Design a protein around this ligand. Sequence first.
Ligand code: C3G
Ligand code: ZN
Ligand code: ZN
Ligand code: ZN
Ligand code: ZN
Ligand code: ZN
Ligand code: ZN
Ligand code: ZN
Ligand code: ZN
Ligand code: ZN
Ligand code: ZN
Ligand code: ZN
Ligand code: ZN
Length: 737
Amino acid sequence: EQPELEARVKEIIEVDGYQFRDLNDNGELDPYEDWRLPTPERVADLVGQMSLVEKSGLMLINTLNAACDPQTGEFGVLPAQADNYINTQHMHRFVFRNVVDVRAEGVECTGTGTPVVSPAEAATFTNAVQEMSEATRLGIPSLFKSNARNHIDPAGAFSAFPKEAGIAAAALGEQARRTGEATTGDMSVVADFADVMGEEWASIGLRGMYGYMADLSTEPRWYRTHETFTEDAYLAAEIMETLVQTLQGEELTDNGLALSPQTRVALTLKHFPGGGPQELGLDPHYAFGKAQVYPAGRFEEHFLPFQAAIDAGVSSIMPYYGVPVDVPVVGGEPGETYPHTGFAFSDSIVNGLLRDQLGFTGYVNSNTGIINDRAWGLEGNTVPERVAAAINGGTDTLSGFSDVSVITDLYEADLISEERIDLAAERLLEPLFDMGLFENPYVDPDVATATVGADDHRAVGLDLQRKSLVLLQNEETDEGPVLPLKEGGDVYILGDFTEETVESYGYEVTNGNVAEGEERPSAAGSDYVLISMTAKTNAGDYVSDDPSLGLNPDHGTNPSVIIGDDGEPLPGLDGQSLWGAADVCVHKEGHEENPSCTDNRLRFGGAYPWESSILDFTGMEAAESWEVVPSLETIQEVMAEVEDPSKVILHVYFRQPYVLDEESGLRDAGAILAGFGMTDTALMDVLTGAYAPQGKLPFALAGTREAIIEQDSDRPGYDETEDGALYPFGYGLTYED
Ligand SMILES: O=C(O)[C@H]1O[C@@H](Oc2ccc([N+](=O)[O-])cc2)[C@H](O)[C@@H](O)[C@@H]1O
Ligand SMILES: [Zn+2]
Ligand SMILES: [Zn+2]
Ligand SMILES: [Zn+2]
Ligand SMILES: [Zn+2]
Ligand SMILES: [Zn+2]
Ligand SMILES: [Zn+2]
Ligand SMILES: [Zn+2]
Ligand SMILES: [Zn+2]
Ligand SMILES: [Zn+2]
Ligand SMILES: [Zn+2]
Ligand SMILES: [Zn+2]
Ligand SMILES: [Zn+2]
């Protein structure tokens, strides 16, 4: 019966033989402080007692990073904005964005450089924030959310696993290993990762996640494929179900939400109803990228993962910024289509589809920066108009919005009903009660130290690293198959490889990695060439209103067409405009003056929009916004210096479904592997034969740029193209002895 309580500001009070927290400091026990009652009564009693300002502060979630004290050397102190956020704007939801790791030696507190904090320091911080949260009138606790933290970047003190697609690769391979085919995967893998993730996240007081992504990799040109698990909706649905089950728990509430005091991380799945199918793979962070198009009519397939997660009881949902072009309303009259606005602002999507068609009973967390920079379809509207559109659309809380007064102003102008704010407040409080945060919101900082990156947890990560590796090609020489490596030999390395780790497996290693001026050693006479390569975008120079870039007619036009519901095409998106024209800094359609460029610098990722279909390595070499690392020119020199290319072994990281074009020569390598982020002991363990490769492609790889241009952004695979797939979904070799 009696749950554990902790209180740093308020007092505890003995009642009816049990203990309770006196969170309103009134000396008697309110129903909302009475953990014996079911959540609906505590919420109802709590909302009853809340100011108009208290209820609307819940509808904000913003960054609240740990700071350091430059005079004391202490890390994990509140920043300056904490006071204004918790006391003035009455916020209880934050995004924690610091890296968690051991700081190198000599690293002292600077100022305002979002510091790296240790596990104990991070928990110190979130405890401090809860202490200030408890200091409010009603002592409502806070929830922190964060983007993912347990994936290698080709980190911190969080246990390192491969990237999302790498986890699916491991799950497909483990199914194949034990059954024979790779369809929906073996979720024992997924559960193991999520279990390590849960304990580590909860141990530092981080109980929410902006994620995981339920999006599908159906458009290889979408830069966000790097955070996608698969292109297969049905595999996606099983991973989502498993993530929710492991991270949130399997006890649902009467309301159908997987929420309990043992819920370690409540998920806010994203990006509803599916960020994947982007026209030309252009991303709707950017004005040119507003469109989501569905040539194969797969809109329903893309939200299957969300239905799986909703049915398992996901806590929260983030709609995307995209605009669903010409998409039949689900469960609606023939001919009816969803509004040509960003999902976050379309009531038919956040209330129609999500809640009435799909049955979701939780809250809706907007994506970040919609009201000011990305209210697609509301380019003309004002900010209060945009806020009201989202809230009345069904969004309950706004990420990156920090002026509570605007919400209150809209209520006092009857632009938002009080029932609606009450309805938000209800949905936002429900998880906090169920997750036990009204009983104890604190954590032990010593225990984060023993938890984040514990040896056993990193063991699970290394296990998944080795099972994520996909072996795509393995020439059979006259001396046998290229992989596994024979013992000993001269090995040439190119690309990010730690020489000592390769060397410790018994090879004498030449390093082809040199500074830009220095003379690269030749590769001739090597027994093995280990190349580790990838492709990266370098588009920081993009500017929407530069006649050399965004408004350069020599860069083509934006074939994307979104006809607004005012009967008009949206600016820059009529089908014959310059790439930079969709940006507000060109069309100016805002109620503002001399507006700034949203798209400048392409800070979030992605190539120049006119280069987004260049996924073949030879093109990427020659492109302006693409860089092959290491240079394809260096690789080709190296693959020649060894006169048999069967001695070459390519570890490729497929950040996006890159295309090994036949002209590049990379298919001449003796073995090709797809890695999804792994340490070099993991990679060398597999290469030298200590473990055999078992992962399977969680997405298909094409062998022609042409197939990239023809494929259907909403459709998996390349089976509908003239050239087809180089490697299908679910492919992967092993060794056989
Ligand atoms: O963290 C946030 O507040 C949210 O930011 C939003 O925009 C970004 C997208 C990509 C990157 N990036 O790749 O750098 C940075 C920001 C995302 O749509 C959302 O998924 C995320 O949860
Ligand atoms: Zn009583
Ligand atoms: Zn009380
Ligand atoms: Zn409050
Ligand atoms: Zn199922
Ligand atoms: Zn787009
Ligand atoms: Zn009134
Ligand atoms: Zn443990
Ligand atoms: Zn030696
Ligand atoms: Zn020209
Ligand atoms: Zn150019
Ligand atoms: Zn496709
Ligand atoms: Zn052809």
